[PDB]
Amino acid sequence: FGIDMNTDYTLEEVGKQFDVTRERIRQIEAKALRKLRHPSRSEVLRSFLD
């Protein structure tokens, strides 16, 4: 995403940054975003909904 940065990026556009270019990059974010999705890591973040 564009968090704290310039324009956002494409996955394998990012994959040439970590140098392991594969469909792992669609996975590392994939399972990580699940971890923030769990409760007590989203407890403060959930509070912005309505």
Partner: protein
């Protein structure tokens, strides 16, 4: 070979600031680079053959060597983007390429002249250098960096040329050196600087 890996290839200078300018931007992006503190008398072999201009430093990533540090520290800031080191706005990006040119042509030659100058020029250079470096003293009050509140490449052109301060016989003096000296407390000990600094250049700090 040199490009034969999925990683870089850098033939740095152990004392030459052209490397040490590149080192900070090199490691400030969090990439795994190969250090090789080599000499002009005996550099590495690959630095001689694949480098048809034969300068230091020299970066090599799977396609060709790159030199002329503005070209080097630009290729990294344009390809490995996070965190960012240069602004977004082509107005503020122009002058940000302009201060760097007003340092490599204004405060570089005072370093070379002090390296090969006469006894008075080493003072004349130190005269023109030391006092004018106090001329830009009030700048740091408005901005925690060189007129750019985020850390950017224009600051990296200063600190390596601010880490060789007494190395060529220099010391500051006058009213308001606390502002610039206190500023050096805010930049001389960053991760991008602390992990990047070569111990060879450190010993002049005592």
């Amino acid at each position: 070979a040199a490009n034969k890996r999925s990683v870089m290839t850098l033939f740095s200078g152990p004392t030459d600031i052209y490397s040490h300018q590149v080192r900070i931007v090199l490691a400030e992006k969090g990439v795994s680079f190969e250090i090789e503190h080599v000499e002009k008398d005996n550099p590495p072999q690959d630095l001689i053959d694949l480098n048809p201009n034969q300068s230091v430093p020299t970066l090599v990533d799977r396609e060709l060597t790159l030199w002329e540090s503005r070209i080097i520290m630009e290729y990294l800031d344009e390809r490995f983007p996070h965190p960012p080191l240069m602004p977004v706005y082509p107005v503020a990006r122009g002058e940000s390429r302009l201060y760097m040119h007003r340092i490599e042509k204004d405060w570089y030659t005072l370093m070379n002249t002090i390296i090969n100058g006469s006894a008075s020029e080493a003072d004349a250079a130190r005269k023109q250098l030391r006092e004018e470096l106090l001329a830009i003293a009030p700048v740091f009050g408005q901005k925690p960096y060189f007129l750019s509140d985020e850390f950017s490449l224009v600051d990296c052109y200063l600190a390596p040329l601010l880490w060789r301060l007494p190395q060529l016989g220099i010391e500051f003096s006058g009213p308001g050196a606390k502002e610039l000296k206190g500023y050096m407390t805010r930049v001389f000990e960053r991760d991008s600087f602390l992990a990047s600094l070569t111990e060879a250049e450190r010993e002049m700090r005592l």
